[model samples]
Target: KTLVYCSEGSPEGFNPQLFTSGTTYDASSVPLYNRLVEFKIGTTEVIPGLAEKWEVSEDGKTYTFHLRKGVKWHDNKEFKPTRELNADDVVFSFDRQKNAQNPYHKVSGGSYEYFEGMGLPELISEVKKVDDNTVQFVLTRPEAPFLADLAMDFASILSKEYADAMMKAGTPEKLDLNPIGTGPFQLQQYQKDSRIRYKAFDGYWGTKPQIDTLVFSITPDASVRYAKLQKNECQVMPYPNPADIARMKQDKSINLMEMPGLNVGYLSYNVQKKPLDDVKVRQALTYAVNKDAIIKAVYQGAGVSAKNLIPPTMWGYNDDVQDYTYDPEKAKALLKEAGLEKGFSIDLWAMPVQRPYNPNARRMAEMIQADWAKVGVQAKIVTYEWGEYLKRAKDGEHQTVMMGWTGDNGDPDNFFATLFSCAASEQGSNYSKWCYKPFEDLIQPARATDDHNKRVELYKQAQVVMHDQAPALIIAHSTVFEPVRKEVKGYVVDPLGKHHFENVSIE
Candidate 1:
């Protein structure tokens, strides 16, 4: 009975839309669907889950991906001798994600802002279907970053036949719950907010997976996850304390995979609502908090301190900005100059769950709370489980909330367009709800520019405005850790932060 894992919370709902905000979804479901395309992996990286060879257009507008021919659906449904996956399936998956009428395909602010602005909204547009195999997309303009968006989770292909059947039954929400794709695993059981189970697809199209079964459990408590992994009760679950990581290194059975960080948790102020409305008040809050202290005490030297909204790992990083340092006296003076010398009190929402790579999110938030107090801007801390917490913030119910930016498509638009523009307010990933004009201008060119230097310059301009506005103070860029059992092999994690389980196996 050699095995891995302990399912803490059942992945109750299967809706892909819910997964966008659902706190529990992870690599467990990666094997369930086949995407049209994927990102370019480093030569030293592991075997890819889906996609074999793909080439971008000279203008970087379109990518012609020739999927590995032998790939198959769960039932050994391999590509035809025609060297093609049904083009209708491709169109169906695209249409399903953008279909306004289909309850399953909800319009996302990130999708709209990034796709439409780049003119590659064609991914969701009703475009030409080249006879059930070859599909062509017409972009509104040249789009270099749109490829990343194409690799997004929403662009994932679904079973058109099954979706249609479910739609006829008036249970579209059930689509995410009951997934049918060409992935190497299939859902065997689900218990909402509790745990999930998947059995290996023996008829998987490409290489057969070695692991026969997987069970995913959700534990809302961060401390409990640390203890269980130590006891070997579960092979892996996020939220291993740094001390636990060191301890695990000593065990012959434990191996920690240090992965690149994709998400940044922000400490944002409501621009329209509180004393934060004043630029000076916002600047004061940013300077008053000691960011370095928070990282050391709380994160255990395991995070990247953000100088601006964009992560340095990103392609468009700008190194020119002057350093952001602690200046509490300057902050106090700014408050006084703004006529808010006395300061004001507001609730700082604390997200209690271990957000992916962020183990000590609450502690970091708490540090900011105490730091802001020094500037006379008293902040009371609040906590919520990840899902409900995101809901409240999206609905704009909270005064201040802990927010995150996970690079929706590895493009600046995911940051500039959604994070800073007006569109982010409606169901977009921009939970802090920041909006500005120059920021919007930055988004337009960043999406369309074929010149790499010019594209980055536009993002640089956008990052500067975000640095000044302080919608949410960019606290830290996270470091990722995925702990797997020593028995697991050939499991390669994607750089763009995708959790595709197609190539993983047990030795």
Candidate 2:
């Protein structure tokens, strides 16, 4: 049988390490690759993927992983692997991103944003092969979330043999485009903005995918995706329009799954810019917009107004922290105090596609524009194609941009350090471009110890710093909905907003 997933957008590329978007990960990482470890299907619990098991040092600074032997890499028309995956493949996968001198480092623009954002370069001192099947990682400091971090999409292993062949042929970029992996599915073809075709890998180390053919029907419009689902054109669809949820519930042909999302959507301000640099200005802007209105209109009861960057479901959430209430007069007064009584014009970049955390960014941005206008702020709405939007936002080209994050790992550090740390400010996922030393001081220490209570306290302190600085406005923590044909069995809604069909089958 065959399975077609109605995907929301095109992936930037297949190399998961280079990009951060969930669309890219769903297409590339979820289907085409497997990390050293992986999140168990539909849950955040870490489980063995490429590595069968691992051991950590008493000091928590070193990690040793034992590779699963006899795992075969997928063969493509352009290249084939000469050897099974081993320690060399694992070493090469990471070192290519960690070292600038590696041949494939600059092959496809060389932006390992997630790797850099997680501060791996500074944290890891070495990744050495202990033997053909054993690999070890030595870190500069003890990291509590080290193992879980390895399970992230960025840590997906690649074939050193394929990379070597591609480099010799002077087409190193093929390793990314014409991908090869030990995953259950292998890329058969990809037509930009149209579809992605994959076939089951016979030599997969894990359980082979029950479906022989998997197709991602690139459907950017949520309504169109739902329409396709109704007609059985596709068996599964993600990020459905919230407005259509009630109607979907009445349809017996589909199974509509709902869960509290482990994600946060927000409007990020580039604090390096003029007026945004002022804390009061940022606070005023946060206060001007009414989140309840956006939740009612944009989310349509699918999301709750977010209070913190990390969702309330996650540990270390600060319940005592107060949110910036909607008060236009207070916003105006703050703007006046910043000597901007006349207001300022700012570019607000909206997302081009639907996300688990954000159903409709354009509608949300328009609402924010009207709210800001009442406070004497002129907001010019702008956007590009999805890929360019992410690239430009990372380069800090916009005054304010709409972006969101679905936690890669369950760790608080994944949300705090990956999105807010000073390390992430330099071309990383920290689109706000706001880096405060005090915030960093609390978060960095939180990562160094194994003490749970100590880490919680530190994270709480960091959240307080975020509240005071108002680097970005926390919008909402949404309810993730996945609609699939009732005939589709064993399909689970991943809280991380990824689509994995490894265990799914058509009746």
Candidate 3:
């Protein structure tokens, strides 16, 4: 990897706990190190890592995984055969994970904070090694999603042997910088706000990467990246004007790769605040937005406009649910009906420099402000440093917030239910703070059902209620525009926004 560009927000430190929108969001996968389990290519089912395979008890509670033996550190140490990688390592990893105090467990009150509630330690009544190659963990309840959860970043395996060595050495804590995982790449050097470089672990148990050096640079200037791409200085980056897309289709040097990206932006209502709590006010805001107008004027044909918080592309989307159609007179009637006859004024929140949408945010917010004014809701657009914006937005301090959600997991529940679940407020994930008893009830059964049709039906019904409630005015299902060099092949943009560079080969 040569160099990529980020227009703003420098990487401050290695502690994943302090992982801000500016940093951790991009490097969580590939070279940065994450997970003993992953939802890799060619598998709809979640599977093991570190351990070769795992089987659950008849009750579906306990898990016993066959440890993959003879693994060694990338440091070129001999592969110790003492069955040194054991249940204790897994236990320590989970312990460090749940520790509210450990920066190593950075899931504290973020989108992933829910993992702490998993009670992996308590649920794990016992962790025992039946032999050198076998390890078992007993759980209190059936965790169908446990393996799926492990595939997420929060469950990444850190070496107990490595952590112990760090404590013994009395070195300054640089675990985040010097992370050790069983993954294909190992971190070698991290220069703050400048660049990150890693070397491949030739001893990795899986298919090893062919590339020798994998480095991620901090070129925060968009123009620099654009210039580099034009000059063949950089191989790939996100920004490409529509004209560039049209131009690239006819050009041989550039490859424009598009995917059904799992990204959604919404006009979230802060229920804890005024006006937004009133259904009429919330519904009024929905009607005020001309979905197609925003699509054509803003994103052109690049995105799909949405009426409900959930995207229609997903299986959970209910065709029967009522999404407020664009109607100025109706919107005015609703605003007045909600006692905001002259249209109550409120502040709208957004972050300008964050990824997924950068230059478009300010323009979009400005356009939205004018749209609301048409319905008599005097709205003011407000911008903040992405970090501060997220914190306040999470705190439910704004009447409405312009926000986006990229999928955390493959499932639809991960998109809608988890995005706005009342239970996730502390984490600032469910910014809409949306919670309804029926929607909550629908999710549990959906998770438990193995039947595809049955699960889809339940989720579909939930979507109906979700849309009718109007928690957030979903805008459009956005597109991911990846401009790649002619050399890079086997590249597909993950709906989850992870850059899967391992399989991405250079000619």
Candidate 4:
């Protein structure tokens, strides 16, 4: 049997460590690779994946994972593994990201953005191979979210044997293009902006996929994707246009699954750029944008206006934190107080593709452009292809950029430290480029301690700080939707925005 998924965009590459885009993770990590641990389908709860079991030290500074023996790596024409997955494979996967001197570290432009953004470089002291099947991670400091972090896409284990053979052949780049993994599915073919093909891997250590083939029809346009779904050309699709949800719900053949997303959509102000550098100016910009209007028009009852950086459902979300009111007069007054009586021209970068958090980014950008214009702010909308958009935004090239995040782990740190920490700012995930010391002081301790109550208090204060700082305008927390054919059984919508088809089967 075959199942086709209407995916939104092309991935940057197959190597999940080198990029932070969800598109990349969906394409590369979801089907082609397995992490030490993984989020259970449709839930934030962690479950065993490559590692059958793990142990954490009392100090919370070390994690030892016992690999599942007899796990077989998928083979391709260029390379084949001579041995089952072991501690060496786990160590090599991490060492490539942790150590700058590793040969594979510099291959394929060698920037481990997620690894650096998570502050793993400083946090992880070493990944030692205790034995063939056991690998231990030694940390420089205690981390409350270590296991969850391991379950993130960047932590997906690669085959050391394949890497070794590729290194000997002087073709390390092929490892990413022609990937190998102990995943439920293996890459069969990929055509840029076209489609991706995968075949169920019989050698998967876990339960084998029910379907024999999985295909990703790269459909960037939501309307087109919906059309494909209606025609039964694709069995599953994600991030449907909010406008279409009502109509789709009425369709007998469609099974629409939804839940409150653990995510935030925002417009990041480049604090390094003048007049955005001024907090008053940033606050003015924040107050100028009408988030409720965006929700009504763009989200169409699918989202709530976000008051904080995290969703209300997530623990540690600050209920007391106030959102900036949509007041054009207040915005104009602040802009004048900041000595910008005359409007300043700024680039407003929109995302090229639809995401779970922001479905119609282009339309949202147009609305924001008009809203800012009413406040006497001249905003020029700019955008690039999905990959270029992320790269340029990360480089701090735009004055204001539209971006969003779906939580990788249930921990509040996944949203706080991963997006706002000083290390993340330097590493490029902190799109605002605002690294406030006061904010850093709060989140740093929040991440290091195992105490849940203490972390909650710190995060609350951090949210207030972020609101006052006005580095980014939190837009909405959407109710994520996934549409599938009624015959597509056992498919679950991952809260993390990943698409996995291991249990999905066509009746």
Candidate 5:
């Protein structure tokens, strides 16, 4: 059987460590590679992937993982591994990302986006091969979220043999395009922004996927995706717009997957830029924008306004935090106090693609433009191709940009520290560049301690600081709305937004 899915957009590349965008995982990571530890299907809890079991030291500074035996890497057309996976592969994977001096990492575009974003380079002191099947990690300090971070897509293990083969052939850089892993599926063909094809790996140690071919039919347009789903061209579709839901449900051939999304959408102000550098100016922008209007217009009542950085379902979310309501009068006064009574011109960015967090960012930007106009602020909307948009935003090219995130590791730090901490300012995740010492001070304590109560207090304090800082306007926690064909079995819409195609099959 063949399973075809209509993906939102194409990825930047196949290498997870080199790129930071989540679309890379959607297109490549889930279908092509296996992490040391992986989130259990349909849940955020880490179970096992390549590593069968793991033990943590009492001091919480050391981790030992016992690898599963006889796990063979996919023997694709370009390369083949001489032996099954071992501790050397684990050590090589971690060292390549953590150590810039490592020869292979430097040659392969050593961005290591997520690894640096989470402060893993400093947190992990060393990684060593204890034996053929065992590996150990020594951390400089205790980090409660360390295991979950390893379970993320960026931490997917690579085939050391494949790397060696590419290096011998004098084409080490090609490893990014031609990836080999111990995943259930292997890449058959990939055409950028066009199509991706995969085939089941016969040597997979785990349960074999029922379908022989798993194809991603890339469709950037939501209407085209929906039409394809209706015509039976694609079995699964992602990010269905709100207007099409009622019609989708009426069609008996289609199955709808709905849940409260575990993501947040927001309008971020680049604090380094003029006017936005002022706290009052950032606060004024938030007050001028209307959250309810955006939810009704873009989300179509499918999401709720956000009060805190983390979602309500996650731990450490502060319910008592203050939420700035839609008040144009207060906005104008704040702008006046900031000596911008005559108003200033700023560029506002809108996303070109759909995500679980924001159904349609362009629509949200238009509403914000109208709302800001009433308060004497002239906003010029800006945009780019989805890939270029992220690259430019990371380079701090926009005064204000629309962006969002779905929690990756199921940890609060994935939301707070990954987006607001000082470390994130340089790591590309923190687009606002709202670095404050007070926020960093609180965030550090929350991450280092295992004490539940102490962590809670620290997180609450951090949120309070953010509430006062107003670097990025907390928009809404959206609802996950996707469509799949009735014949497609065992497909789950994970809250973390990671897709697994191993168990999926077309009837």
Candidate 6:
């Protein structure tokens, strides 16, 4: 396996528990660790991963996972696991996320962002080991999306035995930097902000990787990354800018892969703040901006303009909801109706970096500002460092924020429930900070059901509420484009944005 790939940037840390960013998981989790359950190829259905099989209680509160017996943790020079995976690792994984008192929980500043975002801690009552290969999870209440939650990238399991050894060696902190897992690859070297090297794990339980070595070259600049792909310095290049795509497709040696991503890029109005609190104002902002213009100018026709928060591909998506067509006159009428004929000035936050949802967030924000200006509303475009931008937006300081959600768990709830629900506002994901009880009520019932029709009905009502309330302007569902070398085979991009390199090969 002699493959060199260019990644967008270095991850914040190797520890997946600390952050919800996809860059971190692309480097560490996908190559190094395995979760109990995983999404089936090209589908959201839960499939066997580390655990061979699982069964849920009649009430759906308890889940028993039967792990595969022969799985072995990667034995590297720094650490060695004398035994295979057991229930202890499973218990430790969840406990560290939820238990504040646990020694390793707060270690490395692990906030367990995704776990808290999905409210998994409150949902899980306890995790217990039935035997060496058997583990059970008892939930506080029946959560139909529980198994789906476990399939998330942040749910990747760690080696409890390895972590314990690191603690005794007076270097437990470096465990994040030097990760050990039961996956198909072992870390050979990690040079922060430069490159990461990995070697195939011979002890891996799944089909052993065919390649000998994999290198992740950290190239932040898209142009340089594209040059690397052309020069054969890198076999794969991720998220090549829209301008480079047409030319890249002309290159016979480059394979430009495209897929409809399960994500939404939108402008969220902080409903808790002034002026934006008025639904008419929010609706006005939606109508004033021409989504078609943004799609052509910013996306270059690479994405689909969205009708609602959830993408059309995801289950329970409501197409019947009302969309605010581009009408500057109508937007002006609404603003005047809300007793604001003079219009008002407010901060509009834009993302600092390029993401799948929006290629150029800053430029897109500039265009959106121009559109709002035509409707007599003045917008002040604001931006911060990507990390700082997210923190500030979540704090509800911005009147409107340009951000998006890449469905983490492959569930409709991951999009609608977490981004629009009242519970999510406290969780730091609901940037709009709209706390409508009826919206939350519609979201809650769907999480407890197995019936597809009933869940669909619930989601339909919730989306209708979102459309009518206009907490956020639904923008577009992006299409992801990745440039790969022609010789590379078995490299598939998941809609959730994970890079599964185990089955990948270089001809």
Question: Judged by TM-score, which candidate is best?
Answer: 2
Compared with the true structure, what per-residue lDDT tens digits does model 4 show for residues 95-116? Answer: 9998999999989878788899
Every model's TM-score: 0.85, 0.99, 0.85, 0.98, 0.98, 0.93
- Cα deviation of 387 in candidate 3 (Å)? 3.8
lDDT of 1: 0.62
Candidate 5 lDDT, 104-178, residue by residue in tens: 878655777678877888899999899999999999999989999888888889888888888899988877888
Stretches of model 4 off by over 4 angstroms after superposition: none
Please report, in order, the local distance difference test score of every candidate based on alpha carbons: 0.62, 0.92, 0.63, 0.90, 0.88, 0.84
> Could you tell me the lDDT of residue 339 within candidate 6?
95
Q: What is the overall TM-score of model 4 with all chains considered together? A: 0.98
Q: Higher lDDT: candidate 1 or 2?
A: 2
Sort the candidates on lDDT, descending order.
Answer: 2, 4, 5, 6, 3, 1
Could you tell me the lDDT of residue 304 within candidate 2?
93
**Deviation from native of the Cα of residue 170 in model 4, angstroms:** 1.3
State the lDDT of candidate 3 residue by residue for 197-302, as single tens digits. 7677777777777666666665655455555666776677664554456766666787878766566777789876777787777888888877677777767666
In model 6, residue pairs whose N, Cα or C atoms come closer than 3 Å (at least 3 residues apart or on different chains), thus clashing, are 1-211, 1-212
State which candidate, 4 or 6, has the greater lDDT: 4
| All models, RMSD in angstroms | 4.4, 0.8, 4.1, 1.0, 1.3, 2.3
For model 2, give the 10-residue run with minimal summed lDDT. 75-84
What is the alpha-carbon lDDT of model 4 when measured against the actual structure? 0.90
- Compose the digit string of candidate 6's lDDT tens values, residues 312-345: 8888888888688999999999999999999989
Highest-lDDT candidate: 2
lDDT of 5 at 138: 98
Instruction: State which candidate, 3 or 5, has the greater TM-score.
Output: 5
Off by over 4 Å in 3: 1-25, 42-47, 73-85, 99-140, 165-173, 219-224, 308-313, 354-359
Better of 2 and 3 by TM-score: 2
**lDDT for each residue of candidate 1 in 1-507, tens digit (9 for 90 to 100):** 223454333342443434453233453335466566654432222233344545566755555544445555543222112232466656666655455565455523223333332233443335446444556555556666555665655556666655565677776544555566776677776677766677887767656666677766666665677566667666665545765667666767767777776677677677767676777877788889898897778777667677777778787677786546799999899989989888888888877666643566678777888888888877888876666676577667777777776665566666666565666655455556667777778877676777888887888877777776677777777776666667666555454554444455555
